[PDB]
Amino acid sequence: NMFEIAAPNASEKTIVDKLFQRDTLVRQSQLVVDWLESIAKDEVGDFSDNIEYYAKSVYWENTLHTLKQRSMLSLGSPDAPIRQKLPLDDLDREDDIRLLKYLFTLIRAGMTDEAQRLCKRCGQAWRAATLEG
Amino acid sequence: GQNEYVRNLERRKAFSHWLAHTAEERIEEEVSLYGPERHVEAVFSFLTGGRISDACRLAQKSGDHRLSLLLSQMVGSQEMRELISLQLVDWNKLQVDHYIQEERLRVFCLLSGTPVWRSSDNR
């Protein structure tokens, strides 16, 4: 009974652990989901357009260098692109789409630690902190 | 008034109760004056005067019950708030989180742990 043995001071973490320990059916569904995550389709890292072409040195580098310069007829002039649609550029949009497909495939396959390390490598502190939660 | 750690913690709890109680009346008066509540000031006043159980009811305009989940298991709050702070400082260093409400950012800095913030605009 140490599996569910706790006090009110025991955290929600230990709560989830005790629930998966005692609830055999939830744990069986979890093992089936773990098998599904293990046997999944994962994109190639350095041998496809996933990361081999998305090896960006800096995040929103295009948005920093240009200012809709691509969407301008001259030389011209995750909270910011949410508050103002006009910010994001096409290059960063496509690269983020690729990195997002990569991270989502990793999460669905269960490699969440590798997805966090990839968010750290790409400079995506936002997605990294989010995955940390 | 009169385990060392436990004793210190109990004293801390009593002092916190005193602080909350001595400011309670003032905080209640202030809130009545606010009228339509504003997360810039209302939330600041609630946070410094405690009463987080009622603060959550006040934050239902956006919807917030992770706090009920906190009252259930008072645990790991330190690390939760620290991760919030990390996210906030990342936003600050990324030149974003600027076109948002002025003192909303002020209140975010409070949970972060920085009592005085010199921003890029030298504010």
In degrees to the nearest 10, what's the CA dihedral of A99, A104, A105, A109?
140
Q: Quick one: B75 exposed, middle or buried, by C-beta within 10 A (0-12, 13-18, 19+)?
A: middle
Q: How big is the CA angle at B95 (ends B93 and B101), to the nearest 5 degrees?
A: 110
Residue B102 has, within 13 A of its CA and on its CB side, a CA count of 3
DSSP secondary structure string, A48-117? STTTTS---SSTTHHHHH-SSSTTSSSS----HHHH-STT--HHHHHHHHHHHHHHHHHHHHT-HHHHHH
Residue A17 has, within 13 A of its CA and on its CB side, a CA count of 11
CA separation for the pair A14, B114 (Å, rounded): 32
End-to-end CA distance of chain B: 44
Q: Give me the resolution in angstroms, 1 decimal.
A: 3.7
Cβ atoms within 10 Å, residue A90: 12
The DSSP call for residue A45 is S
The answer to whether the CB of A4 falls within 8 A of the CB of A22 is yes
Q: B residues 82-101 near A, CB within 8 Å?
A: 83, 86-87, 90-91, 94, 96-100
Cβ-based contacts under 8 A for chains A and B: 39
CB contact under 8 Å between B87 and A84, yes or no, is: no
Looking up tokens 């936003």, which residue turns up? B91
Write out the residues of chain A at the interface with chain B, using a CB-CB cutoff of 8 A. 8-13, 15, 79-80, 83-84, 125-126, 129, 132-133
Q: Which pair of tokens denotes residue B48?
A: 């410094």
Chain centroid to CA B9? 21
CA separation for the pair B46, B58 (Å, rounded): 9
3-state secondary structure of B90: helix
Backbone angles phi, psi at A116, to 5 degrees: -65, -40
The DSSP call for residue B15 is H
Task: Give the closest residue to A78 by CA, choosing from A65, A59, A62.
Answer: A59
CA separation for the pair A36, B77 (Å, rounded): 33
Chain centroid to CA A87? 22
Enumerate the residues of chain B whose CB falls inside 8 A of the CB of residue A126.
87, 90-91
B3-7 long-range Cβ contacts below 8 angstroms, 24+ apart: none
Q: Quick one: B49 exposed, middle or buried, by C-beta within 10 A (0-12, 13-18, 19+)?
A: buried
**What Cα–Cα distance (Å) separates residue A131 from each residue in A12, A28, A107, A127, B41?**
18, 25, 9, 6, 31
Q: Which pair of tokens denotes residue A34?
A: 């773990």
Point out the residue among B73, B91, B97 whose CB comes nearest to the CB of A15.
B73
The answer to whether the CB of B75 falls within 8 A of the CB of B11 is no
- Which amino acid is residue B97, in one-letter code? D
